[PDB]
Structures are given as structure tokens and as C-alpha cells.
Amino acid sequence: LSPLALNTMDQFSSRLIPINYDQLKKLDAGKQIKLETTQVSGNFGTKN
Amino acid sequence: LDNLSITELNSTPEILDEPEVKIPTDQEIMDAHKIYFADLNFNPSTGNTYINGMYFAPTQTNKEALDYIQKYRVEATLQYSGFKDIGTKDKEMRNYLGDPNQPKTNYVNLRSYFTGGENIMTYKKLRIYAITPDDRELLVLSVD
Amino acid sequence: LGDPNQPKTNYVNLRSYFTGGENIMTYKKLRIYAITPDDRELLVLSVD
Numbered sequence: 001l002s003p004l005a006l007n008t009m010d011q012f013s014s015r016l017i018p019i020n021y022d023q024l025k026k027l028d029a030g031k032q033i034k035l036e037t038t039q040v041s042g043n044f045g046t047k048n
Numbered sequence: 049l050d051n052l053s054i055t056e057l058n059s060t061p062e063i064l065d066e067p068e069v070k071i072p073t074d075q076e077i078m079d080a081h082k083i084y085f086a087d088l089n090f091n092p093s094t095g096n097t098y099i100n101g102m103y104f105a106p107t108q109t110n111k112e113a114l115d116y117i118q119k120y121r122v123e124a125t126l127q128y129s130g131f132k133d134i135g136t137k138d139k140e141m142r143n144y145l146g147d148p149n150q151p152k153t154n155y156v157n158l159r160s161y162f163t164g165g166e167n168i169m170t171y172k173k174l175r176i177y178a179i180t181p182d183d184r185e186l187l188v189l190s191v192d
Numbered sequence: 193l194g195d196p197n198q199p200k201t202n203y204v205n206l207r208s209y210f211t212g213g214e215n216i217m218t219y220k221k222l223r224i225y226a227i228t229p230d231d232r233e234l235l236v237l238s239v240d
Contacts, residue, residue: 025138025140026138028139028140028141029118029119029138029139029140029141030115030118030138030139031118083212085213105212105213106210107210108210144213145213147207147213149205149207149208150207150208150213151208
């Protein structure tokens with residue numbers, strides 16, 4: 001399956017992720033944006 | 049014979065593989081810059097015809113070599129000063145020849161370099177060195 | 193034909209092809225191939 005898309009930053013998924021003019025110019029020069037995972041939130045299962 | 053049947057079969061593999069990075073050689077990088085155009089400034093007083101910038105035309109083969117190169121280093125000749133280095137700057141990726149229809153290709157904006165505001169003369173010495181991510185510079189354009 | 197009333201139809205933008213900004217001459221050789229999704233091409237236009 002294809003990867004999932006991440007293009008919102010607000011809590012309700014209604015606001016896109018913007019960049020500046022200079023950051024856009026850096027992107028036009030071939031520079032690449034990296035992604036770093038800092039933490040993950042998750043659940044485990046038990047028996048009630 | 050026994051148990052003869054006709055069945056439909058379904059299978060949808062599309063590509064199952066992806067191309068390698070295939071970093072260009074120096075010769076390919078040099079041939080990617082073989083075709084170029086010079087953006088000129090002509091405000092008419094007495095044949096001014098000063099350089100504004102430098103294009104690099106896209107072909108059917110030089111895409112991966114052109115997107116491999118940024119940070120062009122330029123040594124040009126100013127109107128009052130002589131032949132000197134004017135620093136290193138990133139590329140700009142403008143539409144070829146300013147045409148809205150032509151694709152975006154590498155553009156060297158010579159007005160943003162470390163000149164003292166002086167124009168860059170035409171038909172004089174002019175050197176542009178393509179700088180790879182491997183920190184090695186290659187002379188890709190020579191005008192004398 | 194640029195008519196707002198006429199429907200949208202197939203158009204070939206020859207200004208966007210891999211030319212060096214050069215003009216394309218009329219009443220000279222000109223061939224256009226239609227490429228099917230099956231990677232099959234057909235000579236649908238010829239001008240000499």
C-alpha cells in the first residue's frame with residue numbers, strides 16, 4: 001500500500017503546513033527536508 | 049484426460065523495482081552545461097549590453113546531471129574592477145529563456161553575487177564552476 | 193479554437209517541447225505520433 005500523507009499541523013486537520021520565501025528558495029536550490037521522529041504515543045491491551 | 053476447466057486469473061504487478069541514484073560522472077556533468085543562454089541588459093544609451101544572468105538549457109538527457117549541481121562559483125570581469133572572484137551562491141531554477149511554457153532549468157543570477165553593484169561586461173573573461181555535493185568544482189563554462 | 197463556447201479538446205503545446213526556444217517553421221516537415229497506453233504509437237498527422 002502507498003504511504004500515508006501528512007499535510008496538516010492543527011488538531012482538527014484543517015490547517016496546512018506553510019514555509020517562507022527563503023525556505024522555498026532553498027528548496028528550489030536542491031536542498032532536502034529531513035524527518036525526525038521524536039516520540040510515539042500508543043496503547044497496549046489487557047483483559048478486563 | 050480428466051477435469052478440464054477454464055479459469056480467470058488476476059495478477060497486477062506494476063514495476064516491482066525502482067531506479068538507482070546513479071550519480072553522474074564529471075564528463076556527464078560537463079556535457080549537461082554545454083548548451084546555455086546569457087541573460088543580457090540593454091538599457092539604450094550607447095550599446096550598454098551588460099550581462100544579467102546565465103541560463104542552462106534542459107535537454108532530454110541532462111536532467112539528473114542538472115539537478116545534481118547547485119552552488120555555482122563565478123569569476124567574472126566587472127566594469128571598473130578587473131577579473132576577480134565574486135563568491136559562491138545557490139542556483140535559482142527559473143523558466144528557460146523566461147518563457148512560461150518552457151520548463152524550469154538552472155539559472156545563475158549574476159546580479160546577486162559579490163559585485164560592488166557594477167555590471168558584468170560582455171565578451172570578456174568569465175568562468176563558472178559547478179560545485180558538486182562532493183565539494184569538487186568543475187569548470188563548465190569558459191568565455192574569453 | 194479559443195472559443196469559450198466550444199468544448200475542450202486535445203491540444204498539443206509545441207512551445208513546451210524540447211526545443212531551445214527556437215521557432216517551428218510552417219510548410220516544412222512535421223510529424224505527430226499518438227502514443228496509446230499500451231506503449232503503441234500511431235502516425236496521426238503528417239505535414240510536408
